Design a protein around this ligand. Structure first.
Ligand SMILES: [Zn+2]
Ligand SMILES: [Zn+2]
Lengths: 163, 163
């Protein structure tokens, strides 16, 4: 059938071995923001176990208002105090510009998106931009650690980015 | 010694047995949208392997503009054609209301957020609502499959929702 069908079949085997329920608050009091990229298995990359960490993911690991919203809830309601941001090499966000993307969408749909596609040219500098977005935000101030990294999709290694 | 420090140490072990790079486009042409909840290991839940699927995650599995942006990039630039939505039982989004959350923030900061906290009272009904958000959206139309599920945090099973 479809991939959804196969993934649902995989869930049968997952459920057989499942242990729960666990408490809602992340047991390691940490939120991870990462790209949606297919090559990043965030749990395996960082040795995360079930129940430990919030994981927030979008196209390009962009600190949008949804990321701020998700961090605010994570911190204020569920007690997380560490933030890890995970960009990576060979990101799709490096491959297009915002104007061209919007133009193509409009060409085909007749409508231009209200949202910014949020492309950027340099993953390392955009970690710095992303860290700055969090640092200056009035709603996400609870963190005791805020660190950013670029994941190398060729080596599997994290490289830290300094502001 | 922070949790970030431990996870970085886990990454050293992850990288020693890493095989890559993989191609950028998800090999299974699928995007998963899921809650950021700490008890959801989306990869193992669905038996996802590296390089197969985009995974998008936020507080509540809310189809925000960021989720639409991510899915649009996912489909138009990176060839995905299936969408899975994963809400779950015992979601933090059922525990608060938007107005209370905004007031609490405004008490602390003097500043009310412009963004909606996006809370909802019922997981099954909100899968329906989330499916409708995607169905009416003019920018995410390339899917051949759009299906929504609630993950039982006590059994690890997925229960499908009829739109
Ligand atoms: Zn990426
Ligand atoms: Zn949730």
């Amino acid at each position: 059938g479809t991939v959804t069908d196969d993934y649902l079949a995989n869930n049968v085997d997952y459920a057989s071995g499942f242990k729960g329920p666990l408490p809602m608050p992340p047991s390691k009091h940490i939120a991870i923001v990462a790209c949606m990229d297919a090559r990043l298995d965030v749990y395996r990359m960082l040795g995360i176990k079930e129940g430990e960490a919030h994981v927030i993911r979008n196209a390009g690991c962009v600190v949008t208002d949804d990321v701020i919203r998700s961090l605010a809830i994570s911190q204020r309601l569920l007690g997380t105090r560490e933030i890890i941001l995970l960009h990576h090499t060979d990101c799709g966000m490096l491959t297009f510009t915002d104007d061209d993307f919007k133009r193509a969408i409009q060409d085909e749909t007749g409508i231009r998106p209200t949202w910014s596609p949020e492309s950027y040219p340099d993953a390392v500098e955009d970690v710095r931009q992303s860290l700055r977005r969090i640092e200056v935000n009035p709603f996400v101030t609870k963190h005791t650690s805020l660190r950013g990294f670029v994941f190398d999709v060729a080596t599997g290694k994290l490289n830290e980015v300094t502001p």
